[PDB]
Design a protein around this ligand. Structure first.
Ligand SMILES: O=c1cc(N2CCNCC2)oc2c(-c3ccccc3)cccc12
Length: 127
C-alpha cells in the first residue's frame, strides 16, 4: 500500500498574491480551525497506509488537508481567497464523500466546517 505525493505547496509557474482576504484566511480562519480540539486529523494528509484505508485514494481523487492549506497560505501560494476557500471545502467534502453520516470523523469535520462558515461570512471586502 502506498500514499500518493501530497498536494503542492510551492509552484514558481503559478501566479500568486498577498491580499487582505488571504491574510484573513490565515490569521483568522486557518488559526481558528487549527487550534480546535477536532483539528488534529486534518492537520496533515490522510495516511491511508497507516490507517488501513486502501480504497481511500480510489474514492478521493482531490485530497486536501489543513497542513497543505497552512503551507500554501504561509507561502502566499494562492492568487485569491476563492482558491483557498475551495481547498477547505474540498477537505470537508472528501470526508463526507468517503465516510458515513454520524461517523466520528464526520462529526469532527462538521464542527470545523461550522466555524469555517462563521468566519468566512465576515471575510473582509478586498482592499
Ligand atoms: O475521511 C477520513 C476517514 C478516516 N478514517 C475512516 C474511519 N476510521 C478512521 C480513519 O480518517 C480520516 C482522518 C484520520 C486521520 C488519523 C486518525 C484518524 C482519522 C483524517 C481525515 C479524514 C479521514
Amino acid at each position: 500500500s502506498m500514499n500518493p505525493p501530497p498536494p503542492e505547496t510551492s509552484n514558481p509557474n503559478k501566479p500568486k498574491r498577498q491580499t487582505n482576504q488571504l491574510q484573513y484566511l490565515l490569521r483568522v480562519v486557518l488559526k481558528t480551525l487549527w487550534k480546535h480540539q477536532f483539528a488534529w486529523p486534518f492537520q496533515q494528509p490522510v495516511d491511508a497506509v497507516k490507517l488501513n484505508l486502501p480504497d481511500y485514494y480510489k474514492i478521493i481523487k482531490t485530497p486536501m488537508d489543513m497542513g497543505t492549506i497552512k503551507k500554501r497560505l504561509e507561502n502566499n501560494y494562492y492568487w485569491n481567497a476563492q482558491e483557498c476557500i475551495q481547498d477547505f471545502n474540498t477537505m470537508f467534502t472528501n470526508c463526507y464523500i468517503y465516510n458515513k453520516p454520524g461517523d466520528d470523523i464526520v462529526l469532527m469535520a462538521e464542527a470545523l466546517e461550522k466555524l469555517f462558515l462563521q468566519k468566512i461570512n465576515e471575510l473582509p471586502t478586498e482592499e
